[PDB]
Amino acid sequence: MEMEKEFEQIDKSGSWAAIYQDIRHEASDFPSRVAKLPKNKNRNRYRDVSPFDHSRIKLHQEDNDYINASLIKMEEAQRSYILTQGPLPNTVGHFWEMVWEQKSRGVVMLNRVMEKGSLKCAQYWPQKEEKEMIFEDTNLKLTLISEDIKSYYTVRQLELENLTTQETREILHFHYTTWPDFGVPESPASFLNFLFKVRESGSLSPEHGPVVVHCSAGIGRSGTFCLADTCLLLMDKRKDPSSVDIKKVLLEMRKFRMGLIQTADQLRFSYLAVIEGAKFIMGD
Ligand SMILES: CCOC(=O)Nc1cccc(Cl)c1
């Protein structure tokens, strides 16, 4: 059923809450035993958001391999994403270790460091060229190379150095800075343009490791970003674009990380994103 019609049918009936609860009821439940070990309590931002054991990213160290991060592998679309929480004061070095070990080209940030008067994630990248950051626990150095500030997002070039081998890599930081403190954006235009700027960069392409995507918990805004990208890729690839079922794609992604899309308003915004995506590409 053409999703644009399914959309108007749900909107006219005001059933967004009912659709959303159906998804919550059918979603996968897999064990997260490593996340709940007592040694890992200060590595988790939220007690109710954990990576599944089967899909968690492992750090390459014998001490403790745990990070709150999941590999979302979309087989038909041929895309992979790592979805993670915003880094904590004691996990900023783990975060950059993961970016290094997984060969990621891009980091996508969908939150501000402070929102609603509270800290949503650590200040994990340098704000001035001449004041670099060293992570002594993981032996990494991070330098700000350049910054391009636009009305709805900022792009930064960063240099990550493995201090053990003196190898360096260029990491691109895509920072969406205008998601409102409450609810979802009124139009998906600036979000879709952000997604197009991440695509343009090569960060989502198979020649690199998976993109790292985060917000505060790494399930809500982060869920919306990967769901819209995968749905628009499938509508490009298939003979029948109208066959793409956004509820079935979301349930596939929920096999790999719990809780993706946190509210009925985020579900409606994701539909609007794909629906409005398909025009400007296909019809007018
Ligand atoms: C066949 C459907 O494919 C799309 O609608 N692609 C698309 C549209 C707008 C923005 C961006 Cl980033 C991608």
What DSSP string runs through 110-173?
A: -S-SEETTEE-S---S-SSTTS-EEETTTTEEEEEEEEEE-SSEEEEEEEEEETTTTEEEEEEE
218 is in an annotated binding site: yes
CA distance 19 to 29: 19
Instruction: Give 252's contacts (C-beta < 8 A, 6+ positions apart).
Output: 74
23 is in an annotated binding site: no
Quick one: residue 243, left, alpha or beta (phi over 0 = left, psi -120 to 50 = alpha)? Answer: alpha
Distance 137 CA to ligand 1 centre (A): 41
**Closest Cα to residue 56, out of 86, 35, 28?**
35
Residue 232 in contact with ligand 1 by CB distance below 6 A? yes
Q: Check if the beta carbon of residue 253 is closer than 8 Å to that of residue 276.
A: no
CA distance 130 to 121: 23
Distance 155 CA to ligand 1 centre (A): 21
Residue from 190, 249, 281 to probe ligand 1 pocket by mutation (most atoms less than 8 Å from CB): 281
Residue 46 in contact with ligand 1 by CB distance below 6 A? no
- Residue of the nearest CA to atom 5 in ligand 1? 278
Instruction: Give 139's contacts (C-beta < 8 A, 6+ positions apart).
Output: 162, 163, 164
CA distance 222 to 82: 10
Pick the atom of ligand 1 nearest to 235's CA. Answer: 1
Residue 242 in contact with ligand 1 by CB distance below 6 A? no
Distance 16 CA to ligand 1 centre (A): 24
Residue from 3, 232, 237, 271 to probe ligand 1 pocket by mutation (most atoms less than 8 Å from CB): 232
Catalytic residue numbers, as ranges: 215
CA distance 16 to 48: 24
Q: State the alpha helices, DSSP H only, in the chain.
A: 3-13, 16-26, 33-36, 92-102, 189-200, 221-237, 246-253, 264-278
CA distance 139 to 264: 42
Residue 67 in contact with ligand 1 by CB distance below 6 A? no
Q: Measured between alpha carbons, how far apart are the two ends of the chain, in Å?
A: 21
- Residue of the nearest CA to atom 7 in ligand 1? 277
262 is in an annotated binding site: yes
- Residue of the nearest CA to atom 10 in ligand 1? 277
Residue 204 in contact with ligand 1 by CB distance below 6 A? no
**Superfamily of structural domain 1-283:** Protein tyrosine phosphatase superfamily (3.90.190.10)
CA distance 116 to 98: 29
CA distance 70 to 218: 9
Instruction: Give 48's contacts (C-beta < 8 A, 6+ positions apart).
Output: none
- Can you give the length of the chain in residues? 284
Collapse the DSSP code of 62 into the 3-class scheme (helix H, G, I; strand E, B; otherwise coil) and give the result: coil
